[PDB]
Design a protein around this nucleic acid. Structure first.
Ligand SMILES: [Cl-]
Lengths: 145, 140
DNA sequence: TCCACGTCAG
DNA sequence: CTGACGTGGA
């Protein structure tokens, strides 16, 4: 499974099903929001933001992406591991990450981003949540919204 | 959603995903084994999930859904569909899961059904479908 | 073995 | 709202 741009897939491309991001090699997991891979430190390779968490899409070049897990079953911390750990190490690896957005014909490839930072958030209950600040790599084609 | 043969879909056709039987209108549910409509049955998927019987012949025994196969099973929704399809003598598409994941096996009728007191004490239905004679052959 | 920003239709 | 012969990858 490959980093960066994917042959055949262009910014603004749309898809109906998660299972096509997998087929085309854009995003492997069938449900999970984060896909990553061993480098042996985990690095992130793509994320889907499609309404499942409290993600922030400004219609700008910055997005806040919520970490997975913790029930955001009963309310638990979130954990810096698997996907979450991937995204973080991708802060330092400065590697590009595909970002796919779910739309109100269901998904759109939004292009490449980097993970500038992450932080923690004591939530409305008392448990952790991570937030990863991704910036879109400047100079890619644009999309409407 | 249509009964009988589907335009564009031929016996022996294969597919990788449940979500293509839906796209092509072969079988709507994404997981469920039985699809029906206002109740008569219109298609079933037998892909290893229950103790179905595939003789490599023209008859198949299809297990009813539910009951955790621990509760009885119930003659309702899909199960009820299949049964009323006994009397409606309407054709039913039958898709088989294979060990690139699914294969349209053609048309069948539901000749009968019965009940089976299982290894625990609760119900299970079994529907005997016979393949409509005179369609191309699937090898196995 | 188990979880996950599934996905459909009653 | 939730049950249903789901998928893929850790
Ligand atoms: Cl698909």
């Amino acid at each position: 499974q490959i980093i960066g741009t994917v042959p055949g897939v262009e910014v603004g491309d749309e898809f109906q099903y998660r299972m096509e991001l997998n087929l085309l090699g854009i995003h492997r997991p069938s449900q999970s929001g984060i896909d990553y891979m061993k480098d042996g430190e985990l690095v992130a390779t793509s994320i889907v933001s499609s309404g499942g968490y409290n993600d922030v899409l400004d219609n700008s070049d910055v997005l806040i992406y919520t970490g997975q897990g913790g029930n955001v079953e009963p309310p638990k911390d979130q954990q810096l591991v698997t996907g979450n750990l991937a995204l973080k190490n991708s802060i330092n690896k400065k590697n590009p990450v595909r970002v796919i957005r779910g739309i109100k014909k269901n998904y759109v490839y939004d292009g490449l981003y980097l993970v500038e930072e992450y932080w923690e958030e004591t939530g409305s209950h008392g448990k952790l949540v991570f937030k990863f600040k991704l910036r879109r790599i400047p100079g890619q084609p644009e999309l409407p919204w």
